[PDB]
Write an enzyme that holds these catalytic residues in place. Sequence first.
Site, PDB file in Angstrom:
ATOM      1  CG  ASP B   8      -1.983   1.059   1.272  1.00 50.11           C
ATOM      2  OD1 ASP B   8      -2.299   1.624   0.194  1.00 50.11           O
ATOM      3  OD2 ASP B   8      -2.485   1.352   2.361  1.00 50.11           O
ATOM      4  CG  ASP B  10      -1.897   7.362   3.590  1.00 51.76           C
ATOM      5  OD1 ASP B  10      -1.062   8.281   3.498  1.00 51.76           O
ATOM      6  OD2 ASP B  10      -2.779   7.331   4.461  1.00 51.76           O
ATOM      7  CB  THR B 122      -2.135   3.436  -3.716  1.00 51.20           C
ATOM      8  OG1 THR B 122      -2.569   4.608  -3.026  1.00 51.20           O
ATOM      9  CG2 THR B 122      -1.766   3.816  -5.166  1.00 51.20           C
ATOM     10  CG  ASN B 123      -8.367   2.769  -1.801  1.00 48.19           C
ATOM     11  OD1 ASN B 123      -8.370   2.011  -2.784  1.00 48.19           O
ATOM     12  ND2 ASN B 123      -9.178   2.583  -0.769  1.00 48.19           N
ATOM     13  CG  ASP B 184      -2.108   1.941   6.589  1.00 49.66           C
ATOM     14  OD1 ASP B 184      -2.483   1.611   5.458  1.00 49.66           O
ATOM     15  OD2 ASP B 184      -2.341   3.051   7.083  1.00 49.66           O
ATOM     16  CG  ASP B 334      41.298   9.081 -16.193  1.00 51.30           C
ATOM     17  OD1 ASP B 334      42.288   8.716 -15.543  1.00 51.30           O
ATOM     18  OD2 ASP B 334      41.200   8.960 -17.445  1.00 51.30           O
ATOM     19  CE1 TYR B 382      49.379   5.975 -16.174  1.00 52.04           C
ATOM     20  CE2 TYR B 382      47.982   5.874 -18.125  1.00 52.04           C
ATOM     21  CZ  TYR B 382      48.303   6.451 -16.908  1.00 52.04           C
ATOM     22  OH  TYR B 382      47.574   7.519 -16.453  1.00 52.04           O
ATOM     23  CE1 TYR B 465      47.071   9.509 -20.043  1.00 56.32           C
ATOM     24  CE2 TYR B 465      45.455   7.868 -20.706  1.00 56.32           C
ATOM     25  CZ  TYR B 465      46.115   8.563 -19.709  1.00 56.32           C
ATOM     26  OH  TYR B 465      45.790   8.349 -18.394  1.00 56.32           O
ATOM     27  CG  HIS B 523      41.769   5.395 -11.726  1.00 57.38           C
ATOM     28  ND1 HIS B 523      42.242   6.688 -11.771  1.00 57.38           N
ATOM     29  CD2 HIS B 523      41.133   5.120 -12.892  1.00 57.38           C
ATOM     30  CE1 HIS B 523      41.918   7.147 -12.961  1.00 57.38           C
ATOM     31  NE2 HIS B 523      41.243   6.252 -13.666  1.00 57.38           N
TER      32      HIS B 523
END
Lengths: 546, 546
Positions: B8, B10, B122-123, B184, B334, B382, B465, B523
Amino acid sequence: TLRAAVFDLDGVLALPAVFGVLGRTEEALALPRGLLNDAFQKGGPEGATTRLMKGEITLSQWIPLMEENCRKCSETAKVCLPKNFSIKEIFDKAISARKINRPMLQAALMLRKKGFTTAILTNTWLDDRAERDGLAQLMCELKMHFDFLIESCQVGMVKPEPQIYKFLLDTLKASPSEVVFLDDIGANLKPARDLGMVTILVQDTDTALKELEKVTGIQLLNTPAPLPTSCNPSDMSHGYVTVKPRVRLHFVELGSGPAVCLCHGFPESWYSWRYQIPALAQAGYRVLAMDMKGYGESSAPPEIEEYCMEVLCKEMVTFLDKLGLSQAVFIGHDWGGMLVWYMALFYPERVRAVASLNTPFIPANPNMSPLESIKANPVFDYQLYFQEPGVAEAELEQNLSRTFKSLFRASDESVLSMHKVCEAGGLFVNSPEEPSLSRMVTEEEIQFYVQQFKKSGFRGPLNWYRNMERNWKWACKSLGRKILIPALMVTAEKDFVLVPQMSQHMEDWIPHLKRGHIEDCGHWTQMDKPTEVNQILIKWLDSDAR
Amino acid sequence: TLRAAVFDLDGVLALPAVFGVLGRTEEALALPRGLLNDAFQKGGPEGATTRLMKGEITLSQWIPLMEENCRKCSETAKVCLPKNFSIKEIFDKAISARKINRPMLQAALMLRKKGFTTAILTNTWLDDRAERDGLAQLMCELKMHFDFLIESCQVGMVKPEPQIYKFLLDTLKASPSEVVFLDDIGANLKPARDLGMVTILVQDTDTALKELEKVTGIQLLNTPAPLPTSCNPSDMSHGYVTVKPRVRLHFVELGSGPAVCLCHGFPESWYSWRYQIPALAQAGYRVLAMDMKGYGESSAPPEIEEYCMEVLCKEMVTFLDKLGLSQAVFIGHDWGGMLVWYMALFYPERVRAVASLNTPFIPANPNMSPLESIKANPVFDYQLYFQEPGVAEAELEQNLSRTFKSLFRASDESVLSMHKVCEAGGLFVNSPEEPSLSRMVTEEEIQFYVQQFKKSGFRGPLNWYRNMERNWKWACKSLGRKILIPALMVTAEKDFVLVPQMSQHMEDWIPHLKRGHIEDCGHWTQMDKPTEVNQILIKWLDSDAR
Ligand SMILES: Cc1n[nH]cc1-c1ccccc1
Ligand SMILES: Cc1n[nH]cc1-c1ccccc1
Ligand SMILES: Cc1n[nH]cc1-c1ccccc1
Ligand SMILES: Cc1n[nH]cc1-c1ccccc1
Ligand SMILES: Cc1n[nH]cc1-c1ccccc1
Ligand SMILES: Cc1n[nH]cc1-c1ccccc1
C-alpha cells in the site's frame, strides 16, 4: 563583389557601447570628463585591458587592476573618487543593460539568407563573474545566427592589431574587397579599410543600415516583418525513449527551464513546431517537440488499438517517467490538442499547464455514439473516409509530395474538396496533380515531411482516427470531472473543420480557461501564423506556467 | 510459494497515514474525537471520498464536499468548527509532510532483486491542486522501483471492493497463495486474506518487516547498506547532437533542474556514472551523462589531433550551443576531470560550477616539455606505452572482457603491474587470462563495456593521451589566469597514479576551491565508492551550483 559581412558586438550588434556608459558614469558621479575612459584604456597595448581582451587574465582578475588605474588617474587629475566607488557594480550594471540590437541582427540575417557569409568579430573577455550567465545567454542567442564568432580572448589578438584582420580573412576564405566590415570604433575600422575592405562606421543603426544597403544592393531597411527563427533538423539534439518493448518515442530538445512538451497533429511531425522551438527556448523553456506515436522516428505499430487515447496518454506518462520529469506543460495542435486535454483530465498531477491550438474540449455525450455525432457534422465526413483500413493509406501514400502540398495551405489556397470525400471517393478527387507551392511552406520543408513519411507511411497516423468508440468509452469515465489546472484554448478564425464556435462552451468544464484567437488563420496554425502563435504561447507560459 | 509482494502507499510506503493526521488535527483544534475522520468517510461507498478515490471527481472538486461533510458532522455533534477552518490548508500540509518510508522501500527493492514481482496498490486521487507537483515527485520516485502501480482513481475501483483484488491478481499473473499483501488498514487487508493471500497488517515498520522476512525466508531487516540506484541502458533517454559534420555526441539524460554534464575518463562510458545519474536527478538536477568523443555511441574519428583538449573543449561548447544551454555544471573523472578544468579556464561563462574526481589541476610548466615531466614520474610510465599508435590498441582490443575485468578493480584487487609497461612490454604482462570478477562490478556490467567498445575500439580513447605537446602549448595561454568560478576537487586515497598529494597546490590557482576526500577508494571512484561520491556531489551542488 561583396560576399561576406562582419559585425562588431559592442555598439553594433549589442547596445549601448562602453565609451557611452563610462561617459554617463563620469557625468552621474560628476567626475572629470574622460577619467574612467582614460583608466580603462591605460597603458594601451601594455595595459590591463589589453591583457584582459587577449585572454591573458579573466574579468574578475581585471576588476582590481581597473580600480588601481582609476585611483592613479584621479590622483594625477587632483580629484577624489566617491567613497562608495565600485567598478564591479558599474560593470555588472552595464553588461546586464546591454541588449541585442534587433534591427542590426535582422540585417545580418537577411544578408546571410541572400548567401553572404556572416561573422562577429569582437574584442571581448573571459567572464568568470558570479553574474556571467547574463552575458553567456546573449552570446548564445546572437552566435547561432552567424557563420563565425571570432573572440579576441580566444584568439589571443585584439582589434586594432593587423594580425586579427588577416586571421578574419583567413577564417572567411575571402579577399578584403569581398568584405563589409561594421564597427562603431574608427581606430578598429582603419586596419580593415587599409586592407581594402568596405567599412561602415556605425553611429546610429539606421544610417549604418542605409550605407550597408547601398553597398550590398540588398534591401535591409523598411523590409517586411521577418518570420521567427526556424529549425534545421541536422542541428537539433535528437532524443529517444523506449516507453514499452516495441515502442520508442523520438523528440527534438532545446533550451533550459520548465519542460514544455509539444504535441503535433495529423499528418504532421515534430517539425510542425519549427517556428515555436527556438522562440520558446529563448523565452526560458526546455522544449520537447515530439514525433507522436506512428510518426517520423517514433515507432509505428500496425494495430488500431495501439492508437487509442488511453494507450497514447499512458505512453506520454511513461515518457515523462523515463526522462525523470515530474511534470511538463503540454501544448497540442489537432490530434495533439485532443491528447493534451485528456492528459489534463486523467493525469493532472503530471501536467503543469495545458494549451490547445484549434482543438476544443467537448465532453463525451454518453447518450450518443461518436459515429452518430460525427455523421451529423458534414465537415467531419473525411473521418468516415478514414475508417476503412487501407483506403486512405493508399491515397495518401500514392504521392507524398502531392499529399503534403495539397494539405499544407493557407485559408485562401484551398485545393481540395473538404466534402464527402466518401462519395467523391478520395480526399484528392478533382485536386491538382502538381499543386502550386503554398506561400506557407518551401519545397525543402515539404521534402522533409515527404522523407519522414517514407519510413512508416499513414497507417499509424490514420489509426488515431480509428478508435472513436474506445475513446468515447474511456472519456465517459471523466464526465464528473472539471479541468482546473492552468489552461489555454487558441482558436483559428479560418479553420473550417475545428471552427472557433466549437470551443464556445469550454468554460462550463474549464472555468479558469484563458484564450487566444488568431485572425486569418487556417488549420495549420503554427506555420500559418508563427509570430502570433509565439506571442500567445510565451505570454501565457510566463503568466501561468512560470 | 511466494513470488509477489504488494504494498500500500499511505501508511506503508509513505508516512504518516491519513487516519493519524485527521486525529492530530482533531486534537490540535480540540474537536470532538473522530469528527474529521467521520466527515472524511461520510456516506461510505456512496460518499464524496469514494467518488474521489474511484476518479469520478478530482481533489479540487472534493475539497468543497469534504467541507460540507465537516459542517454536517459538527452540527449533529453540537460543536463549532473554528472560524478559520480550512480543509485545503490541512490537506496541503499533510501531503507535503508525507515522505517515502525508506526501510519499507529498501525491503521492496531487496524482494524484487531476489526475483519477486512487486506492486503498489493504492486508494488515491486525481490531484489538480496548485501544489500537485510535490505528490507527482513522490510517486515518480517510488513507482520506478516496482513492476506495477495500481491506482484506484485510474482503475475506477477501490479497496476494500473485491474486484480490485481480482484485478491485482490478474495484473500480477499470480495465484493468491503466491502473494504477500501489506496494508496498514485491517478492512483493506481482509479481502486479500479471504482470497488466500499472505497478509501483513502494518503498524510499525520493523514488526511488518519481521513478519515479511519470516514469510519470504529473505533477510530484509539489519541488511548491509544497499548500493545507490543504478541505470538500465534500455530504460534511459538517449540524446544525440551533431557538433560538426563528422562528429556526433551521445548522452543519457535524466531529471529536471540545472544542467549537470558528467564527463567520464579513460577507457570508460556514460555508464561509469550509472550510480550518480538517478541520485543527482532525484536531488533536483538535469543530468547529461556523456559518451565522450571516441567512445560508445559518440563519433570516433581516427586522427590524433581530433582529441586535443582545445578541440574537445570547443565541441563541448558546441554541444551546449546546440542544446540551447547557456551553462552547465561540469563534473569530470580522469580525462573527463582534465577536460572540466580546461572548460573552467577557457569557457568560464559556460561553466556554472566545476568538479573533478581524482584529476588535479596543475598549471603547465612553460620551462619543461610534458614528455620530460611525464618520464620523471614512474607511475605515468603507461602513458609512454600509449604513445605509439597501434601498440596499446592491439593489447587492449585482443580480449575486451579481460581488458575491463583487469582494469575495473578495487584498491586490494590489483592484477596488473602498473610499472613499465614499456619494458615488460604491455599493460597485461604477467596478468591473468581470466581475471576474477571484482566485488565492484557484475559480469553484466563488464559485458556492457565490452559491447560499447566493439564499435570503435581503443584508437579514439588512446588519442586523448597523444596530444601532450599540443595540450601543453594551449594550456600555456592560460598561465596568467585563475579559476574563480565555484570549484570542487575530490581526492581518492588509493588512486596510485592520480594521488591525493598531486592536488596539494591547487588553492594557489583556485583560491575558493572546496574539497572532498574518499578513503579506501581506488581509481574507479564512481563505482568504487558510489554512496560517498553521491553525498559529496549533492552537498556541493546544493551549496555552490544551486
Ligand atoms: C482531434 C481532431 N483533430 N482533428 C479533428 C479531430 C476530431 C476528432 C474526433 C472528433 C471530431 C474531430
Ligand atoms: C487533416 C485535417 N484535420 N482537420 C482538418 C484538416 C485539414 C484542414 C484543411 C485542409 C486539409 C486538412
Ligand atoms: C470518440 C469520442 N466521443 N466523444 C469524445 C471522444 C474522444 C475522446 C477522447 C479522444 C478522442 C475522441
Ligand atoms: C588526465 C589524466 N587522466 N589520467 C592520467 C592523466 C594524466 C594526463 C596527463 C598527464 C598526467 C596524467
Ligand atoms: C587507466 C588509468 N588511468 N589512470 C589510472 C588508471 C588505472 C588505475 C588503476 C588500474 C588500472 C588503470
Ligand atoms: C601536456 C600538458 N602539459 N601540461 C599540462 C598539459 C595538459 C593540458 C591540458 C590537457 C592535457 C594535458
